[PDB]
Design an enzyme around this catalytic site. Structure first.
Site, PDB file in Angstrom:
ATOM      1  CB  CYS A 175     -28.449  27.448  23.759  1.00  0.00           C
ATOM      2  SG  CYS A 175     -26.676  27.597  23.282  1.00  0.00           S
ATOM      3  NE  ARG A 190     -29.333  29.485  27.453  1.00  0.00           N
ATOM      4  CZ  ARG A 190     -30.435  29.445  28.173  1.00  0.00           C
ATOM      5  NH1 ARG A 190     -31.164  30.551  28.295  1.00  0.00           N
ATOM      6  NH2 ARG A 190     -30.820  28.294  28.746  1.00  0.00           N
ATOM      7  CD1 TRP A 206     -17.490  25.255  21.526  1.00  0.00           C
ATOM      8  CD2 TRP A 206     -17.120  27.373  20.855  1.00  0.00           C
ATOM      9  NE1 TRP A 206     -17.485  26.052  22.650  1.00  0.00           N
ATOM     10  CE2 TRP A 206     -17.260  27.353  22.270  1.00  0.00           C
ATOM     11  CE3 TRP A 206     -16.872  28.599  20.214  1.00  0.00           C
ATOM     12  CZ2 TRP A 206     -17.164  28.516  23.047  1.00  0.00           C
ATOM     13  CZ3 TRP A 206     -16.784  29.758  20.985  1.00  0.00           C
ATOM     14  CH2 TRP A 206     -16.915  29.706  22.388  1.00  0.00           C
ATOM     15  CD  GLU A 249     -23.858  20.212  19.686  1.00  0.00           C
ATOM     16  OE1 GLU A 249     -24.801  20.689  19.019  1.00  0.00           O
ATOM     17  OE2 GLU A 249     -22.876  20.900  20.027  1.00  0.00           O
TER      18      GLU A 249
HETATM   19  C1  HEM Z   1     -20.439  28.658  21.593  1.00  0.00           C
HETATM   20  C2  HEM Z   1     -20.685  27.340  21.585  1.00  0.00           C
HETATM   21  C3  HEM Z   1     -22.097  26.716  21.654  1.00  0.00           C
HETATM   22  C4  HEM Z   1     -22.380  25.530  22.219  1.00  0.00           C
HETATM   23  C5  HEM Z   1     -21.375  24.552  22.888  1.00  0.00           C
HETATM   24  C6  HEM Z   1     -23.791  25.287  22.048  1.00  0.00           C
HETATM   25  C7  HEM Z   1     -24.481  24.174  22.485  1.00  0.00           C
HETATM   26  C8  HEM Z   1     -25.758  23.783  22.123  1.00  0.00           C
HETATM   27  C9  HEM Z   1     -26.331  22.451  22.237  1.00  0.00           C
HETATM   28  C10 HEM Z   1     -25.517  21.233  22.762  1.00  0.00           C
HETATM   29  C11 HEM Z   1     -27.600  22.494  21.790  1.00  0.00           C
HETATM   30  C12 HEM Z   1     -28.700  21.389  21.643  1.00  0.00           C
HETATM   31  C13 HEM Z   1     -28.606  20.202  22.602  1.00  0.00           C
HETATM   32  C14 HEM Z   1     -27.874  19.055  21.926  1.00  0.00           C
HETATM   33  O1  HEM Z   1     -27.452  19.222  20.744  1.00  0.00           O
HETATM   34  O2  HEM Z   1     -27.701  17.980  22.589  1.00  0.00           O
HETATM   35  C15 HEM Z   1     -27.860  23.865  21.414  1.00  0.00           C
HETATM   36  C16 HEM Z   1     -29.029  24.369  20.894  1.00  0.00           C
HETATM   37  C17 HEM Z   1     -29.246  25.678  20.488  1.00  0.00           C
HETATM   38  N1  HEM Z   1     -28.333  26.748  20.457  1.00  0.00           N
HETATM   39 FE1  HEM Z   1     -26.447  26.677  21.227  1.00  0.00          FE
HETATM   40  N2  HEM Z   1     -24.348  26.384  21.411  1.00  0.00           N
HETATM   41  C18 HEM Z   1     -23.342  27.286  21.136  1.00  0.00           C
HETATM   42  C19 HEM Z   1     -23.531  28.477  20.449  1.00  0.00           C
HETATM   43  C20 HEM Z   1     -24.759  29.015  20.048  1.00  0.00           C
HETATM   44  C21 HEM Z   1     -24.948  30.290  19.386  1.00  0.00           C
HETATM   45  C22 HEM Z   1     -23.805  31.230  18.917  1.00  0.00           C
HETATM   46  C23 HEM Z   1     -26.262  30.472  19.232  1.00  0.00           C
HETATM   47  C24 HEM Z   1     -26.946  31.672  18.564  1.00  0.00           C
HETATM   48  C25 HEM Z   1     -26.265  32.809  18.463  1.00  0.00           C
HETATM   49  C26 HEM Z   1     -26.959  29.334  19.785  1.00  0.00           C
HETATM   50  C27 HEM Z   1     -28.334  29.136  19.817  1.00  0.00           C
HETATM   51  C28 HEM Z   1     -28.958  27.914  20.009  1.00  0.00           C
HETATM   52  C29 HEM Z   1     -30.353  27.631  19.741  1.00  0.00           C
HETATM   53  C30 HEM Z   1     -31.474  28.592  19.274  1.00  0.00           C
HETATM   54  C31 HEM Z   1     -30.536  26.167  20.103  1.00  0.00           C
HETATM   55  C32 HEM Z   1     -31.834  25.339  20.013  1.00  0.00           C
HETATM   56  C33 HEM Z   1     -31.888  24.797  18.581  1.00  0.00           C
HETATM   57  C34 HEM Z   1     -33.196  24.086  18.395  1.00  0.00           C
HETATM   58  O3  HEM Z   1     -34.139  24.293  19.193  1.00  0.00           O
HETATM   59  O4  HEM Z   1     -33.303  23.301  17.429  1.00  0.00           O
HETATM   60  N3  HEM Z   1     -26.013  28.461  20.256  1.00  0.00           N
HETATM   61  N4  HEM Z   1     -26.733  24.617  21.621  1.00  0.00           N
HETATM   62  C1  LIG Z   2     -25.294  27.074  17.148  1.00  0.00           C
HETATM   63  C2  LIG Z   2     -25.198  25.662  17.668  1.00  0.00           C
HETATM   64  C3  LIG Z   2     -24.004  25.221  18.223  1.00  0.00           C
HETATM   65  C4  LIG Z   2     -23.914  23.910  18.683  1.00  0.00           C
HETATM   66  N1  LIG Z   2     -22.745  23.502  19.235  1.00  0.00           N
HETATM   67  N2  LIG Z   2     -24.978  23.070  18.566  1.00  0.00           N
HETATM   68  C5  LIG Z   2     -26.167  23.486  18.034  1.00  0.00           C
HETATM   69  C6  LIG Z   2     -27.357  22.555  17.949  1.00  0.00           C
HETATM   70  C7  LIG Z   2     -27.602  22.007  16.542  1.00  0.00           C
HETATM   71  C8  LIG Z   2     -28.572  20.824  16.504  1.00  0.00           C
HETATM   72  C9  LIG Z   2     -28.896  20.307  15.237  1.00  0.00           C
HETATM   73  C10 LIG Z   2     -29.773  19.218  15.115  1.00  0.00           C
HETATM   74  N3  LIG Z   2     -30.087  18.718  13.886  1.00  0.00           N
HETATM   75  C11 LIG Z   2     -30.331  18.635  16.263  1.00  0.00           C
HETATM   76  C12 LIG Z   2     -30.035  19.128  17.543  1.00  0.00           C
HETATM   77  C13 LIG Z   2     -30.647  18.477  18.784  1.00  0.00           C
HETATM   78  C14 LIG Z   2     -31.770  17.479  18.484  1.00  0.00           C
HETATM   79  C15 LIG Z   2     -32.595  16.960  19.675  1.00  0.00           C
HETATM   80  C16 LIG Z   2     -32.281  17.151  21.036  1.00  0.00           C
HETATM   81  C17 LIG Z   2     -33.147  16.604  22.012  1.00  0.00           C
HETATM   82  C18 LIG Z   2     -32.901  16.766  23.490  1.00  0.00           C
HETATM   83  C19 LIG Z   2     -34.279  15.882  21.656  1.00  0.00           C
HETATM   84  C20 LIG Z   2     -34.556  15.714  20.310  1.00  0.00           C
HETATM   85  N4  LIG Z   2     -35.657  15.024  19.944  1.00  0.00           N
HETATM   86  N5  LIG Z   2     -33.728  16.248  19.364  1.00  0.00           N
HETATM   87  C21 LIG Z   2     -29.156  20.225  17.664  1.00  0.00           C
HETATM   88  C22 LIG Z   2     -26.283  24.808  17.581  1.00  0.00           C
END
Ligand code: HEM
Ligand SMILES: Cc1cc(N)nc(CCc2cc(N)cc(CCc3cc(C)cc(N)n3)c2)c1
Ligand code: HEM
Ligand SMILES: Cc1cc(N)nc(CCc2cc(N)cc(CCc3cc(C)cc(N)n3)c2)c1
Ligand SMILES: [Cl-]
Ligand SMILES: [Cl-]
Ligand SMILES: [Cl-]
Ligand SMILES: [Cl-]
Ligand SMILES: [Zn+2]
Ligand SMILES: [Zn+2]
Ligand SMILES: [Zn+2]
Lengths: 411, 407
Positions: free
Chosen positions: B106, B109, B278, B283
């Site tokens: 993430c 963070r 958000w 994304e």
């Molecule tokens: C506040 C704004 C937030 C932003 C901008 C953000 C951004 C992101 C992004 C960009 C990714 C994946 C990389 C991609 O999509 O290219 C990600 C993954 C993730 N985020 Fe955040 N996030 C936010 C809030 C949160 C919150 C509130 C949580 C939990 C409380 C969280 C937990 C996670 C987790 C566990 C992943 C990995 C998901 C996975 O492995 O499939 N995020 N986040």
């Molecule tokens: C809480 C929260 C907030 C926020 N703004 N964004 C998220 C992530 C949600 C998410 C959803 C999907 N389906 C896929 C990815 C990455 C899929 C991916 C990434 C990379 C690097 C490789 C791969 N194979 N797939 C991220 C969570």
């Protein structure tokens, strides 16, 4: 044991068995992944198994494993190791070895080409002047008037570690960088330290933005010596844009031949510390890294300014827009001047094909995702969604320290 | 056992001590790096509980105090008698915030400590779940001024009484296979959409049909519910320069809300724990719109822009990609819905990472996911070496419930 990789765009699943032939270390443990860390004299005793492992691989590839010729060669190498402490590769083994080091190069997206490498055997070389001549020939052959051909030139192997051949340049062709009293840099900031060494060694610096560095060559552990690559051998491309007429007035050019000269080639346990190799550029190496890195030519601002982009807020994606236009320009210039270059869509597409083929025919294709995915537009290339397994196969190319840190000077 | 990471753009070198607290497994060995792989008893429970409570009491400057000791005793007693234990609210809030803190993938963070935790451990039915979720959605959305939140349903017991939200995100668009051979809507959700149809959903069969929630309480059969449409804030996508962009008919939802993960705190397992933040602009504009297996609109956009699509080397894909992303950011900003661009998000993360290094001694980060899916190299995270390791509390993947659930 079998290992599966998945492509998240296509759902294709491949099975790796080649990882079982893995040797050296990744830096990773079950507790820590070092996947994004850039960098994480041998005994008779350690050397013969390394030799054997290599020659077993060589003789399998030529379909002569366990043949009389195979055993005779193992025995011949064994005795030579015992009585001399090292051994010499046959020409055929050397060719095969250099080709496999490329084949095994997990950070290289260009590997579809691995088998077409031209190998120049410079193991008869004894002096820096000899090296210079070999390197000129390499440059002229590889350049081929813009129709670039892969090549490597291989100088004598390490013996006691006191008689190393080294090319002190990180690439055969690169531009001087000069740090100014005011703290600014003229030319390429990546090469400031090496430029200073060159100057200290007697190089008369033109002190311009694109001065081709001289070669600094060390033979047989001696002090290195300065040489100018003949300018007529250095192919360069003025950078222009197909619709923006002001782009040429930036004064940009790049050299056509990327030639890595600071790595170490390991074959059958032997160490080739001077083994310059070259191919051709993928466009983003020049357009993204060389031009747009902040620690490099850093031209994004100047270009976006000329484009009259809204630069008050990052959220206009002004940096992204300029980045693209610069990369368009690099490809357009190369293609127009008929110098081999590859765009990142094309190179990544080829690599995926290469990779699938390697799984079928070889049982795997070790690959470092961090390096394989291009430095712009990652997600819309077919490598981004490709899972990869990184592991170290020999023969290989390795990093070595910069020789100015380890060399014992003689004067 | 004392690890260094270098930034190759600035030369700054940082020392990680936090990794010696790492715990679960990476997937990697000395021989093989799995860094790019997406998915690589009372006796068990007490060490996990103790490990957690120790870090909790340490964090409130009370380590080795009576209250620390007594809590450890209380939990030990409860595990012996009940085979499980209950977290105090304070422990729950800390565990949840830290699970986000420890999310190595993430980029967002820097915000970790501002998480709003909704304790839904008293929920018993799917209707209850639905009420809690609508409340979460409305709170998080906040009329466009988004606030991070998590809502936490009762923890796993025997494993046959699990609470699950069957959706992958609280808000997502339907996917339909057409007689045509092609795909209307979001291809990512085709399979789940059919489970909705199979369970009774009247699908409108449009391109942007907000899916119904499918909720499983107490290990019971899951139930369908529709989120009040007035609670689903959506944004029509337009471009600040290209008038024709509106006619592609594109929209996206403002609230990203991951609802399929498992929250592990002190050995306890929260199988239903939707959380939301958000969007980072890429994304939607890079992944959701441009992946070949998603809305895949690159070809269509490039056509409208009249680019030369004859050869890859004109970089038409790249030109279109940028424009699409500009339009996403523009549209969210114009409608005053929180969104962050990848430059801003990554700069914030680099600030956060350095903070974590000096105050916590490290920051687990997965470069493969942290580097944005476009323009990687020109963001400050690209040149940053990162160390990836597993700290607890954590979010974990868990299998899709339809593969698991018995009726
Ligand atoms: C506040 C704004 C937030 C932003 C901008 C953000 C951004 C992101 C992004 C960009 C990714 C994946 C990389 C991609 O999509 O290219 C990600 C993954 C993730 N985020 Fe955040 N996030 C936010 C809030 C949160 C919150 C509130 C949580 C939990 C409380 C969280 C937990 C996670 C987790 C566990 C992943 C990995 C998901 C996975 O492995 O499939 N995020 N986040
Ligand atoms: C809480 C929260 C907030 C926020 N703004 N964004 C998220 C992530 C949600 C998410 C959803 C999907 N389906 C896929 C990815 C990455 C899929 C991916 C990434 C990379 C690097 C490789 C791969 N194979 N797939 C991220 C969570
Ligand atoms: C022929 C066309 C080639 C292309 C297009 C190509 C492309 C690339 C690129 C793009 C990278 C690093 C990622 C980046 O710079 O963005 C790379 C790395 C590398 N290449 Fe290739 N390459 C080619 C030929 C070769 C040859 C002939 C060899 C050796 C015989 C080679 C060996 C390597 C090695 C060892 C690395 C990793 C360098 C490092 O770790 O710093 N390549 N290549
Ligand atoms: C033979 C050959 C042909 C060809 N076309 N290109 C090459 C590679 C040359 C190269 C040279 C430098 N100075 C840096 C990098 C990547 C620097 C880098 C990449 C990543 C992913 C991270 C990081 N920190 N640094 C690559 C070799
Ligand atoms: Cl380069
Ligand atoms: Cl770089
Ligand atoms: Cl999403
Ligand atoms: Cl993705
Ligand atoms: Zn690893
Ligand atoms: Zn760079
Ligand atoms: Zn994707």
């Amino acid at each position: 044991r079998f290992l599966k990789v998945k492509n998240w765009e296509t759902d294709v699943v491949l099975t790796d068995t080649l990882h079982l032939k893995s040797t050296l270390e990744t830096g990773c443990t079950e507790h820590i992944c070092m996947g994004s860390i850039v960098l994480p004299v041998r005994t008779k005793d350690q050397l013969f198994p390394l030799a054997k492992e290599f020659l077993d691989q060589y003789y399998s590839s030529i379909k002569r494993f366990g043949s009389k010729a195979h055993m005779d060669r193992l025995e011949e190498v064994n005795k030579e190791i015992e009585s001399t402490s090292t051994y010499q590769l046959k020409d055929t083994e050397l060719i095969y070895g250099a080709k496999h080091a490329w084949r095994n190069a997990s950070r290289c997206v260009g590997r579809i080409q691995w088998s077409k490498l031209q190998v120049f055997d410079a193991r008869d070389c004894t002096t820096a002047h000899g090296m210079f001549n070999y390197i000129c020939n390499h440059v002229k052959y590889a350049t081929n008037k813009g129709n670039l051909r892969s090549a490597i030139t291989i100088f004598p192997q390490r013996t006691d570690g006191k008689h190393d051949f080294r090319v002190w340049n990180s690439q055969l062709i690169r531009y001087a960088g000069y740090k100014q009293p005011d703290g600014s840099t003229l030319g390429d900031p990546a090469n400031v330290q090496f430029t200073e060494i060159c100057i200290q060694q007697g190089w008369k610096a033109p002190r311009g933005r694109f001065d081709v560095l001289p070669l600094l060559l060390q033979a047989n552990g001696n002090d290195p010596e300065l040489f100018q690559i003949p300018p007529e051998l250095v192919l360069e491309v003025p950078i222009r844009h197909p619709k923006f007429d002001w782009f040429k007035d930036l004064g940009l050019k790049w050299y056509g031949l990327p030639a890595v000269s600071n790595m170490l080639l390991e074959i059958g346990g032997l160490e080739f510390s001077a083994c310059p190799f070259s191919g051709w550029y993928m466009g983003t190496e020049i357009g993204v890294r060389n031009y747009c890195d902040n620690s490099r030519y850093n031209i994004l601002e100047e270009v976006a300014k000329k484009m009259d982009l809204d630069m008050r807020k990052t959220s206009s994606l002004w940096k992204d827009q300029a980045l693209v236009e610069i990369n368009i320009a690099v490809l357009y210039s190369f293609q127009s001047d008929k110098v081999t270059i590859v765009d990142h869509h094309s190179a990544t597409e080829s690599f995926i094909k290469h990779m699938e083929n390697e799984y079928r025919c070889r049982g795997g294709c070790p690959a470092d995702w961090v390096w394989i995915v291009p430095p712009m537009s990652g997600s819309i290339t077919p490598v981004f969604h490709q899972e990869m397994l990184n592991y170290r196969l020999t023969p290989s190319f390795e990093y070595q320290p910069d020789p100015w840190n380890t060399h014992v000077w003689k004067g």
